[PDB]
C-alpha cells in the first residue's frame, strides 16, 4: 500500500555474528516501487544514520537529499482548500481529479490512512491571484466517494512522479527554463492583447515547450495528523509565497509546533524523549546548565530555595532536607538508583527500615547518601556512561518483565503515559510523580468522588496526608495547562513494575518547588 508511517528507529550494529541494538529515535520511512526507499528524520541523528549506512554500501546505493529536496507541513481543516487554490496541474490527471474532491472534505480524520496524491504542477509564480477551485458539487458528497477512493488509485503516474523526483537528471531538467518575474510580467502584459477580445484573463497560459514542469508530492500523516508536501529545494520559495498569501494562513514555529504536538498526546525527540541517547544527553545538559546559570544569576533572597522547604515528605530524613531529586532538571539517575536500593531492601527482607567498599545498606538514608555521593563524584566528569532509563514497549511481550552490589548497572524501563488532573491543581515541567499509599486510599477516592461544603460548593480546604519518600515512580517532562479539555495535562513516564503494583489508576503529582500533592489518573500512550 506504500503508506507513510512514523516509527521508532534504532542504530543496529552487527560486525559478524553479534547484534547489539541501541535506541536511536524517530524516523519516517516510505517505499516507492519496492526498491526506492526514502528515510527522513532529524539532521543531528541523520548524520549518524548516513554514516552507519555508508559503512555498509557494498551492495547498496545511497543518495543524500539535504539541499535538493524539501518538505513543508500543513495543519488544520482548511489546509487543503488553500493548497488546492495554489496548486495547478499541467494537463489532465486522475490524481488531481481525486485531490479536487478531497479539498472539499474539510475533515482530515474522515479520510483513510492511504492518501498520497502526486503530479506535475505549474510554477507558483505563474498564477496572479489564488483563485479557488470549482465549488458546485459540495452538497453531493457522501461516503461512496471515500469508499471508492480506496479502490481507484493511479499508481502509475504517482510512481512516475516519484521516480522523476528521485532521479537527479529530471530534477535538474526541471530547472530548464525558470522564467524571471520580469518575464512573467511581460507575458501578463502581452496577454492583455489576445485574439479573444471578449474576456479578461489575468493569468498566463501553460506551454509544452517554453515552461518547466514541476513535480509535487502530497502525503498525509496519521500520527502527527498533518499534510506534508514535498518539493525540490529551489522550487519551495514560490510555493511558500503563494501559500502564505492566503489570508487564513500563519507561519507556525518550532515552539508552536511543540504546543500543537503536545496538545493531542504526542512526544518530542530532543525534549520529551528521555530514553534515547542524543535526546536525553542534550536535554539533561542544556536544560540543567541553563537553569543553573539562571539560578546562580539571581542573588540570595531572590530565588526559590529548593534546599530549605519544610513539609515535603512525612518522616523527614536528615539527608537532603529540601528537594529529593535535582533542583533544576528531572533527573532519572536518582530515580533509578533509589528504586534499585528499595528493591534490594525488599529483597533482603520483606519490610523496609527508614532510620537507624560501600556499606551494606539497611535503610533508605544510606541509599540517599549513595545517590548524593554518586552525584558529587559525577560533578567532575561525564554522566550517563551507559544509560539511566530504557523503554520496554515490546520486551514484556517478548519474554517477560524481569526485575552483586552496583545500584547503577541495570536500568529501569518506563512506559509513556499521560496523567490528567481530575481536580484543582496546575502542573509544570520537571514534576514528580508519586504513587498513592495503601492506608490513605479511601480519602483520595472520596476526594475524587466529591466532598462539598454545607454551602454547596466544593471543599479543598482540608489537611493533606503527606506521603512518604520512597514513592517516586516517574517524572513529568511536558506539563502545561491543557486548553482542549479545561484541565492540567501531564506528560510523564511511570515504571511498569509500579504500574502493575497498584490496583488503581490513581496517581499523585507534585511540583519541584511546591509542597502540595494533586490527584489524577494516567493513561497509557502507544508511542
| Residue ranges that bind other proteins, judged by CB under 8 A | 5, 104-107, 109-110, 112-113, 138-139, 141-143, 146-147, 150, 453-456, 526
Q: For residues 288 and 395, which CB has a smaller minimum distance to RNA in the complex?
A: 288
| Phi and psi angles of residue 476, each rounded to the nearest 5 degrees, phi first | -85, 125
Q: How far apart are the C-alpha atoms of 292 and 287, rounded to whole Å?
A: 8
**Least distance (Å) between residue 150 CB and other proteins:** 6
Going by C-alpha positions, the residue among 405, 465, 468 that lies closest to residue 434 is: 468
Name residue, grid cell 516519484. 162
Can you tell me whether residue 284 is helix, strand or coil?
A: helix
Size of the site for RNA (CB under 7 A): 78
Q: For residues 110 and 254, which CB has a smaller minimum distance to other proteins in the complex?
A: 110
Evaluate whether 219 touches 116 at the Cβ level (below 8 Å): yes
**Least distance (Å) between residue 107 CB and other proteins:** 5
Binding at 201: pick from RNA, other proteins, none (beta carbon under 5-8 Å per type): RNA
Q: Per the structure block, which three cell numbers stand in for 183?
A: 518575464
Binding positions for RNA, 436-475, rule CB under 7 A: 449-450, 455, 457-461
Q: For residues 164 and 423, which CB has a smaller minimum distance to other proteins in the complex?
A: 423
Question: Interface with RNA includes 14 (CB under 7 A)?
Answer: no
Evaluate whether 417 touches 524 at the Cβ level (below 8 Å): yes
**Least distance (Å) between residue 115 CB and RNA:** 15
Q: Per the structure block, which three cell numbers stand in for 90?
A: 499541467
Give the Cα-Cα-Cα angle 122, 83, 174 (nearest 5 degrees).
25
Evaluate whether 389 touches 413 at the Cβ level (below 8 Å): yes
H or E element: which one contains 230? strand 227-232
Binding at 113: pick from other proteins, RNA, none (beta carbon under 5-8 Å per type): other proteins
Q: How far apart are the C-alpha atoms of 211 and 116, rounded to whole Å?
A: 26
Q: How far apart are the C-alpha atoms of 323 and 300, rounded to whole Å?
A: 18
Binding at 481: pick from RNA, other proteins, none (beta carbon under 5-8 Å per type): RNA
Binding at 147: pick from RNA, other proteins, none (beta carbon under 5-8 Å per type): other proteins
Binding positions for RNA, 336-365, rule CB under 7 A: none
Q: How far apart are the C-alpha atoms of 488 and 480, rounded to whole Å?
A: 6
- Identify any residues that bridge with 5 across adjacent strands, giving them in sequence order: 29
Q: Per the structure block, which three cell numbers stand in for 78?
A: 482548511
Q: How far apart are the C-alpha atoms of 144 and 116, rounded to whole Å?
A: 19
Question: Interface with RNA includes 515 (CB under 7 A)?
Answer: yes
Among 2, 6, 48, 89, binds RNA (CB under 7 A): 89
Among 201, 207, 372, 501, binds RNA (CB under 7 A): 201
Among 189, 350, 360, 404, binds RNA (CB under 7 A): 189
Q: For residues 22 and 138, which CB has a smaller minimum distance to RNA in the complex?
A: 138
Binding mask 103-142 for RNA (x = CB under 7 A): ----xxx------------------xxxx-xxxx-x----
Q: How far apart are the C-alpha atoms of 274 and 285, rounded to whole Å?
A: 12
Binding at 150: pick from other proteins, RNA, none (beta carbon under 5-8 Å per type): other proteins
Residue 16 to residues 19, 53, 438, 447, Cα–Cα distance (Å): 8, 16, 52, 60
Binding at 155: pick from RNA, other proteins, none (beta carbon under 5-8 Å per type): none
Q: For residues 131 and 294, which CB has a smaller minimum distance to other proteins in the complex?
A: 131
**Least distance (Å) between residue 499 CB and other proteins:** 20
147: how many CB neighbours lie within 10 A of its CB?
10
Burial group, residue 77, by CB count within 10 angstroms (0-12, 13-18, 19+):
exposed
Residue 186 to residues 3, 206, 500, Cα–Cα distance (Å): 43, 15, 73
Binding positions for RNA, 386-405, rule CB under 7 A: none
Question: Interface with RNA includes 298 (CB under 7 A)?
Answer: yes
Q: For residues 15 and 135, which CB has a smaller minimum distance to RNA in the complex?
A: 135
Q: For residues 454 and 503, which CB has a smaller minimum distance to other proteins in the complex?
A: 454
Interface segment toward RNA; rule CB under 7 A; list 101-109, 157-165, 166-174, 400-408: 101-109
Evaluate whether 19 touches 12 at the Cβ level (below 8 Å): yes
Binding at 257: pick from other proteins, RNA, none (beta carbon under 5-8 Å per type): none
Q: Per the structure block, which three cell numbers stand in for 411?
A: 536500568
Q: For residues 301 and 503, which CB has a smaller minimum distance to RNA in the complex?
A: 301
Among 66, 316, 424, 524, binds RNA (CB under 7 A): 424
Q: For residues 351 and 455, which CB has a smaller minimum distance to RNA in the complex?
A: 455
Q: For residues 209 and 400, which CB has a smaller minimum distance to other proteins in the complex?
A: 400
Q: Which residues contact 209 (CB under 8 A, 6 or more apart)?
A: none
Question: Interface with RNA includes 55 (CB under 7 A)?
Answer: no
**Least distance (Å) between residue 411 CB and other proteins:** 25
Q: How far apart are the C-alpha atoms of 205 and 194, rounded to whole Å?
A: 11
**Least distance (Å) between residue 283 CB and other proteins:** 28
Amino acid at each position: 500500500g506504500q503508506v507513510l508511517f512514523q516509527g521508532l528507529i534504532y542504530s543496529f550494529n552487527e560486525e559478524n555474528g553479534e547484534d547489539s541494538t541501541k535506541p536511536l529515535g524517530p524516523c519516517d520511512v516510505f517505499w516507492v516501487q519496492k526498491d526506492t526507499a526514502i528515510i527522513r528524520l532529524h539532521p543531528s541523528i541523520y548524520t549518524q544514520v548516513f554514516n552507519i549506512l555508508l559503512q555498509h554500501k557494498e551492495k547498496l546505493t545511497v543518495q543524500d537529499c539535504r539541499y535538493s529536496l524539501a518538505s513543508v507541513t500543513l495543519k488544520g481543516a482548511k489546509a487543503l482548500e488553500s493548497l488546492a487554490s495554489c496548486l495547478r496541474s499541467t494537463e489532465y490527471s486522475k490524481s488531481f481529479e481525486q485531490f479536487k474532491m478531497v479539498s472539499m472534505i474539510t475533515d482530515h480524520n474522515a479520510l483513510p490512512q492511504r492518501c498520497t496524491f502526486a503530479f506535475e504542477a505549474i510554477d507558483p509564480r505563474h498564477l496572479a491571484a489564488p483563485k479557488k477551485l470549482n465549488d458546485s458539487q459540495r452538497k453531493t458528497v457522501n461516503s461512496d466517494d471515500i469508499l471508492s477512493l480506496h479502490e481507484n488509485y493511479p499508481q502509475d503516474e504517482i510512481n512516475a512522479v516519484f521516480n522523476e523526483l528521485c532521479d537527479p537528471e529530471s530534477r535538474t531538467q526541471s530547472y530548464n527554463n525558470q522564467n524571471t518575474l520580469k518575464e512573467i510580467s511581460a507575458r501578463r502584459y502581452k496577454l492583455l492583447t489576445a485574439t479573444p477580445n471578449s474576456i479578461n484573463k489575468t493569468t498566463v497560459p501553460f506551454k509544452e515547450s517554453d515552461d518547466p514542469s514541476i513535480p509535487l508530492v502530497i502525503i498525509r500523516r496519521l500520527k502527527t495528523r498533518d499534510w506534508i508536501v514535498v518539493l525540490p529545494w529551489f522550487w519551495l520559495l514560490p510555493l511558500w509565497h503563494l501559500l502564505n498569501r492566503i489570508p487564513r494562513m500563519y507561519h507556525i514555529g518550532l515552539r508552536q509546533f511543540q504546543q500543537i504536538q503536545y496538545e493531542n498526546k504526542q512526544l518530542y525527540f530532543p525534549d520529551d524523549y528521555p530514553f534515547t541517547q542524543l535526546g536525553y544527553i542534550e536535554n539533561s545538559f542544556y536544560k540543567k546548565e541553563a537553569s543553573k546559570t539562571k539560578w546562580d544569576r539571581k542573588p540570595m533572597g531572590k530565588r526559590i530555595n529548593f534546599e530549605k522547604i519544610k513539609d515535603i515528605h512525612n518522616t523527614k530524613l536528615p539527608a537532603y532536607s529540601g528537594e529529593i531529586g535535582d533542583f533544576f532538571s528531572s533527573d532519572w539517575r536518582f530515580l533509578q538508583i533509589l528504586r534499585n536500593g528499595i528493591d534490594y531492601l525488599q529483597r533482603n527482607d520483606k519490610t523496609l527500615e527508614l532510620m537507624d567498599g560501600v556499606r551494606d545498606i539497611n535503610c533508605v538514608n544510606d541509599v540517599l547518601e549513595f545517590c548524593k555521593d554518586y552525584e558529587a563524584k559525577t560533578k567532575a566528569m561525564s554522566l550517563s556512561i551507559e544509560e539511566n532509563i530504557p523503554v520496554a514497549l515490546c520486551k514484556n511481550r517478548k519474554c517477560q518483565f524481569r526485575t552483586s552490589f552496583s545500584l547503577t548497572f541495570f536500568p529501569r524501563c518506563i512506559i509513556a503515559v499521560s496523567c490528567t488532573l481530575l481536580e484543582r491543581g496546575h502542573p509544570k515541567d520537571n514534576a514528580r510523580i508519586y504513587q498513592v499509599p495503601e492506608k490513605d486510599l479511601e480519602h483520595w477516592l472520596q476526594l475524587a468522588k466529591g466532598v462539598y461544603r454545607p454551602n454547596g460548593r466544593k471543599d479543598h480546604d482540608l489537611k493533606i496526608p503527606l506521603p512518604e519518600v520512597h514513592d517516586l515512580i516517574g517524572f513529568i517532562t511536558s506539563g502545561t495547562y491543557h486548553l482542549n479539555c479545561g484541565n492540567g495535562m501531564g506528560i510523564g513516564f511511570i515504571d511498569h513494575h509500579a504500574a502493575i503494583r497498584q490496583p488503581t489508576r490513581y496517581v499523585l503529582i507534585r511540583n519541584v518547588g511546591t509542597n502540595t500533592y494533586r490527584l489524577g489518573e494516567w493513561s497509557k500512550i502507544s508511542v
